[PDB]
From a paper:
The [name] (eIF2A) was identified as a factor that stimulates the binding of methionylated initiator tRNA (Met-tRNAiMet) to the 40S ribosomal subunit, but its physiological role remains poorly defined. Recently, eIF2A was shown to be involved in unconventional translation initiation from CUG codons and in viral protein synthesis under stress conditions where eIF2 is inactivated. Based on these findings, eIF2A might be a tRNA-loading factor in unconventional translation initiation events, such as non-AUG translation initiation, and an alternative factor of eIF2 when the active eIF2 is limited, due to the stress response by eIF2 kinases. eIF2A is predicted to contain two to four WD-repeats at the N-terminus and a coiled-coil at the C-terminus, but this prediction has not been structurally confirmed.
Since the C-terminal region of eIF2A is predicted to be highly disordered, we prepared a C-terminally truncated eIF2A (residues 1–424). We determined the crystal structure of the C-terminally truncated eIF2A at 2.5 Å resolution. The final model consists of residues 3–234, 242–248, and 256–412. The crystal structure of the truncated eIF2A revealed that it adopts a nine-bladed β-propeller fold, with the same overall topology as the regular β-propeller proteins, involving circularly arranged repeats of a four-stranded antiparallel β-sheet motif. There are two molecules of eIF2A-WD in the asymmetric unit, and no significant structural differences exist between them (the root-mean-square deviation is 0.98 Å for 391 Cα atoms), except for blade 6. The electron density of blade 6 is not well-defined, as compared to the other blades, due to either the crystal packing or the flexible nature of this blade (data not shown). However, the central channel of eIF2A-WD has an inverted structure, with the wider opening at the top and the narrower opening at the bottom. Furthermore, the opening at the bottom face is constricted by the inward twists of the AB loops in eIF2A-WD. A phylogenetic analysis revealed that the surface residues on the top face of eIF2A-WD, including these loops, are highly conserved, in contrast to the abundance of non-conserved residues on the bottom face. Especially, the residues at the top faces of blades 6–9 showed strong conservation. This highly conserved top face is positively charged, and the most positively-charged regions are the grooves between blades 3–4 and between blades 6–7.
Residue numbers in the entry: 3 to 234, 238 to 248, 256 to 260, 265 to 412
Amino acid sequence: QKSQFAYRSSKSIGLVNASENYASPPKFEAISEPARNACYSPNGKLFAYATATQVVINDTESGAKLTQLPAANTYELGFSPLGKYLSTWERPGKEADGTPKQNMKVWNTETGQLVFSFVQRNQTGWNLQYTCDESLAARLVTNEVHFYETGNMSKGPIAKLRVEGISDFALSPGQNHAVAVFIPEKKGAPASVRTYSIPNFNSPLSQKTFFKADKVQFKWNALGTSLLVLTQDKSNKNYYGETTGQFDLDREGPIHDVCWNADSKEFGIVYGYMPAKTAIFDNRANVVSIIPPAPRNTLIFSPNSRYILLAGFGNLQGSIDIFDAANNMKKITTVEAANCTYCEFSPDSQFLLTAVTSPRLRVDNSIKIWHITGAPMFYEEFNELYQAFWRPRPLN
């Protein structure tokens, strides 16, 4: 329909229908206060932006304001998978008497009701995780993991997890709800990774342990069946879990990016000291494609799982290449976006957005939308641009 994206600069904030000669939906206008943050719901039906005083939820079709949240001093925002809940991280603190304040609260989007409120100090892993049906939520306590019913989480944890000494965890986005958890290294014991079905707390699905591991990184695919695991000062190594006791490098050095494919059939890796080589796999850990060493640090799959992007960010001279899984890994396009700090396919995988953002860069902030062929369709100069992103659509 309309190729809509959002933008927020130091000067303004708005939604832009690229199919409409780049105009905003008629019923849209921001708050008195300057915006400090913004985001879309996973299905792109809603838009939220944060100002000092309040938080406003709009309709991405009309731009019409829908909901008002009395959330002040916010820094982070997050939509639940079906956008029926929105979480707001504030900066932590203590109450008049001395009580720690409820930094992050959960809100309803069609009633504007404060359903819940937690105390937290971290910004990393702040939000609740959710199932895809948005029926279950998950919080992280020392040496425990809590589960909730999203409909009625006020009553408390409907379920808890047995295992002890949990450092981080990650839910499954499959049809049937599953969990993946991690235990940091202690004395006389290595780190460990665990998977559980939510029905089965009693019966683990995987129980693996890992050494010289203080940290970890989980990467489920769209189908909650397979799961990548990454051990990460002196060394880094990459593992694989497939739920079920399943385990499955050509260049010595760091892995720069790890990414699944939208169809959950393939995945790729940007690894080793530069120029970084790139390898595409299958759901089995077998190579499909070997992209030769190039100055790249970032890999992205197109939503339609047809195109593969390979770029270099975090520095100047940032080019972009686009490869085609269907055409024998042909390259069809090479563009450059120097100092690009953000890049993303349009929902229909036909266009490509690039941007340069502050404070990751205080010079040359801009927006540029590209065809999949290489032909630009838009460009806009900013002084201090903060974010710019597509309005996500499902199964277009």
